[PDB]
Design an enzyme around this catalytic site. Structure first.
Site, short mmCIF file in Angstrom:
data_model
loop_
_atom_site.label_atom_id
_atom_site.label_comp_id
_atom_site.label_asym_id
_atom_site.label_seq_id
_atom_site.Cartn_x
_atom_site.Cartn_y
_atom_site.Cartn_z
CG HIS B 271 -2.42 -0.33 0.73
ND1 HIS B 271 -2.70 -1.36 -0.14
CD2 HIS B 271 -3.60 0.24 1.04
CE1 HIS B 271 -4.00 -1.41 -0.36
NE2 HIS B 271 -4.57 -0.45 0.35
NE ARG B 274 -5.42 2.28 -2.23
CZ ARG B 274 -6.41 2.48 -3.10
NH1 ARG B 274 -6.22 2.29 -4.39
NH2 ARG B 274 -7.60 2.87 -2.67
CD1 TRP B 297 -10.37 5.20 -1.43
CD2 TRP B 297 -9.11 6.63 -2.62
NE1 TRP B 297 -9.05 4.94 -1.15
CE2 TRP B 297 -8.26 5.79 -1.87
CE3 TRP B 297 -8.54 7.61 -3.44
CZ2 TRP B 297 -6.88 5.94 -1.88
CZ3 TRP B 297 -7.15 7.68 -3.54
CH2 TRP B 297 -6.34 6.85 -2.76
CE1 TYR B 306 -3.87 5.21 3.47
CE2 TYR B 306 -4.89 5.94 1.44
CZ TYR B 306 -4.57 4.92 2.31
OH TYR B 306 -4.95 3.63 2.02
#
Lengths: 324, 320, 324, 320
Positions: B271, B274, B297, B306
């Site tokens: 991940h 991302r 998303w 994030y």
DNA sequence: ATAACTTCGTATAATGTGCTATACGAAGTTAT
DNA sequence: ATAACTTCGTATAGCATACATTATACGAAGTTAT
DNA sequence: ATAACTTCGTATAATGTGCTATACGAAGTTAT
DNA sequence: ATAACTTCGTATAGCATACATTATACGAAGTTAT
């Protein structure tokens, strides 16, 4: 949930059958004939439809190599028959709900691709335009106007057939113009007026010069041209959508020749090719999504977005960042 | 009733595929665990008794497991029951309340759900500046993988499913990657993930040296053995364990071998790009609406999670 | 729905009472005492609560001139008691659902205004700063740092009390800086680091020079200063939020004097005044909603938007168009 | 049962206020109508029989009424039943199907739901250029009303509820109008509708010549009698019939008396400035997100409906 | 041998329909 | 006696965890072409 | 008279929670 | 005989009306301070 109740419901259905388009009815009967045959064949009862049987059937549709959207239509029409009849829907069953979920999964995981019309863009309009512009042939002139009212306007098939001669009034430098009536929804519109260029107008002309359209203006702009090259006006009838979609098929073959690869689905130009091309062209030329999701009367972008997706302009922010 | 319940569950197993392979992996993993605990205390594992499940969650907590893991155990148990046509353990105060209490006690002691170490453009530019020069098949592949990972934000498994027949081109020469199914969406429409000119080159170079193009129905990425020979396949994809290893391996390369701590996220992983791209975009002044389209998303909360790192609008207002 | 079932539920409630904050519990008891007294008075049963009685009660809360949000809390806690006990919620009743709907309507239609903290802006920080900057007085120096860590940072009360001396490390030109731990949510953060200016840092200093804070760094930055002007450090205790909110009340009175207009609700500066002011100041200075809905750790704009609403910058597109 | 039903309905009447005064106005209006039709054909008006309701809708259609009106009759009947704890007429195919058919037949014959004649900035600028010069109380008021209407997009009744104590000021001098309840939202938070400097002046001038400020709890707009004397009141608002008449009157002023057709929307009316402002903003290149904040919409469909008029991206692409 | 996986188990993070039209290949219908 | 708090209780404003999955993390343990 | 409403009825268009913290005035608690 | 359609039927892509209110439109019919 009694045979008398269902009987009443089905009489209700018929009495107010105009609660649905004839197209809807067409598909309902279509599915019922398909489901019924299968039931007969596979020794089952077709009405009421039992969740396990409808399951087997859906898997049968899948094995028949039928599309996910198609199987949807089948369950869809079946659910509608049981809902409008007082009986439980097949979708309301766990077995049928799961299987539908599984099949959708299984198919995507194998290549299932929704398709759309092959773009017919200015690069294609100019080409044909250059191949049939000096041709004396009636149906040759007619097909060019069409390719014009169609790329230039983005009007749907069902609508370009509806045009009448009056509707084609003029304008700026002798530029043509037109009142359509496209929308068939209440809280929408009653209709728009559309315009043409020095190109698309100069063509639509000849058709009129030769079509003998300037006769009884209750007339439609597009008529059928017989084998001798003589057109046949008719205020009472409209070129079926098949023919109109025909001019797009015909024209592609002229340039590209015979029907090709695999045996089916969007190999040549279809009724939607023109819209689909104009849009990208209008997108490539950097035209705000207004006109784009507008020159077609588009009430929902997902559609215009699936059309301009391979266009570099629609590449993304990451490409933008990566390239500085 | 016992008959019905046997059917509903049987009805689930029949259309196994309606669910992710993983969802099944976890259902069976929890059941194994639960069943284990149950045998230890002489308890009937199904149907489950709220009181017994409560004891189980607390037990999980005592094992020092994460709130998210405990919640997963409750979720699976909940599914077993719900899908059976039975009452969910969470349907009882003992279970509802204990879960809240466990979360609460845990977080009010710090406990926080982690996230992958960011893999950003600087990281990409650095890794590429170094690996660009390698002629090894592995390096060529790995550099392409990382390129798409960062560029597209795709998840390990969406990347691992990319088949050769899935690539296209914009007129300008950029590669377009069509994605059918993802964590959040299974449709025949799919999305087209475009690649920059540079990542495009990276990918092209991999295709070339590898021969995957030898079969349009071939998975873009595949194993590459000790001798440099790539092993193309249209039936078996490269394992996510491998794809994620590319991230950790690349990390090791630039920063050395990792801590002895045993912690997670000590090096880049699946991940990492991302998390990192989302962030890179936020910094660039990219729009949330657009950042979301990047990661696929449909909502706005992971996207916000994030970022929360970058400031000083203050000494600034105060200094002047 | 049996006394044994309810008994089990309430034992479940107590056994895992840490499933809720003590604040929640405080309000639950609060409402129950209020509802119970009323029931006693008005000759009714308080448990289980009957929809008609809870109705009368809600109207009684309204007549008591209580806010819509307050009545919500009351029905809210009642619904929670019946839900966590196995009994039907009062909200699930038609009478109670309607009345709540009516009262909400009736109140808005009479002036009911939600209130918020009075802005404490740089225009206020500078002022106080100019009134208490040359004062030898301990608690005078302390209150200025506070007014500084608070405007400068936007940290909540519960959090400025939590600060420890170590947490205050330094930086750029001898600029101070700080690790807080604000969030108490799992998928959030573990915490941030915050900085100070030549202003807010030069102040927080004195407090430390005089507070005798540089003693056992397990110490908190903010302590109580007794009547003799001597501070009392304590790694084991924290200035209650009341006091901290006190410095804001106290300070406003200094400038504006005694408690004023009407008799209640936000007449002077409260714990939130600083955030609420910094924000507008940061908004007036045209600072993107990031930092704004960020320097406070704001996960939802509605809140920062209700704070910068009377600001000309937030006026609207129509004002923009109208004025060209 | 008969007992319960008597209660549920009685339970509704008790908390009448949970609903808009208008919702009640229409419930009673339909019932009157339905009941009338029922007595004519010797039918029991309640509980209603789908077959009888179907006959009623068709009857409405035969009267040549709008699909929206027919739907309103079905909606009220539906509410009566639903709120009574009874089955809704729409709950039967006869009724579901006939409604669809009526809509369908009607629209496929043209029929389209209209919208208010736009009142845009040009219209505002023109009306103001003319009325600015009047010293009459009426003109002063009317010009202020139109100013807020266009500026704020508020609806007749939100405007008619503005009390003097509801106005504020930005530091820069612009008037701020606080709105408590609207068609789409009843909260104690409310919104603050700011006014441009110019509309602000317009409003100030009205306040002044009128004396409404003589009581903060006074409605901003009020009657102004033949002699020019404004009649301020904190208990009675200016009727929407009056407020809407200001639009039609202003229209008459510039364009003369209206058609004999009897049609609706021949002159500006209550919604004319909403329709017009939304549009004005779209033209200005304002963002949908922002256009929506202007009108207080929470969704995106009315906003789109109002625009669909403006073009020519084509002769343009073709000409070159 | 051994690089470079696969597999697989437990741990733990991340996400958010239903009516109506078109597509075409066929089959049928007129007029050349 | 009070200043300077603390704890209380009720009044109100400010948030943000529970569903039902479906995915990743990471290594141990097993595999296979070299 | 009458302007300028109000009122009111039928017609028809338009829209989209529940746990936890703070606010304060009080009351209580220490140390000056 | 076929070109040029039309109508058919099944396959699939493209949309966008039903809830439950709450509001406006517009005038007739009644009102009240002038």
């Amino acid at each position: 949930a009694t045979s008398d109740e269902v009987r009443k419901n089905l009489m209700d259905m018929f009495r107010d059958r105009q609660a649905f388009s004839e197209h809807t009815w067409k598909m309902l009967l279509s599915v019922c004939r398909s489901w019924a045959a299968w039931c007969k064949l596979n020794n089952r009862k077709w009405f009421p439809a039992e969740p396990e049987d409808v399951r087997d059937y859906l898997l049968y549709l899948q094995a028949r190599g039928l599309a996910v959207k198609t199987i949807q239509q089948h369950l869809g029409q079946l659910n509608m028959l049981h809902r409008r009849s007082g009986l439980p829907r097949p979708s309301d069953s766990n077995a049928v709900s799961l299987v539908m979920r599984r099949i959708r999964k299984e198919n995507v995981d194998a290549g299932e691709r929704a398709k759309q019309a092959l773009a017919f863009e200015r690069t294609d309009f100019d080409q044909v335009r250059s191949l049939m512009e000096n041709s004396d042939r009636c149906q040759d002139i007619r097909n060019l106007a069409f390719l014009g009212i169609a790329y230039n306007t983005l009007l749907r098939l069902a609508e370009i057939a509806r045009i009448r001669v009056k509707d084609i009034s003029r304008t700026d430098g002798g530029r043509m113009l037109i009142h359509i009536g496209r929308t068939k929804t209440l809280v929408s519109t009653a209709g728009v007026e559309k315009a043409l260029s020095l190109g698309v107008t100069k063509l639509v002309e000849r058709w009129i010069s030769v079509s003998g359209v300037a006769d009884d203006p209750n007339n439609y702009l597009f008529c059928r041209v017989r084998k001798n090259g003589v057109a046949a006006p008719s205020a009472t009838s409209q070129l079926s959508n098949s023919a109109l979609g025909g001019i797009f098929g015909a024209t592609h073959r002229l340039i590209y020749g015979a029907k090709d690869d695999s045996g089916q689905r969007y190999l040549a130009w279809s009724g939607h090719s023109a819209r689909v091309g104009a849009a990208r062209d209008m997108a490539r030329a950097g035209v705000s999504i207004p006109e784009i999701m507008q020159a077609g009367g588009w009430t929902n972008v997902n559609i215009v977005m699936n059309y301009i997706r391979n266009l570099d302009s629609e590449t993304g922010a990451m490409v933008r960042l990566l390239e500085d």
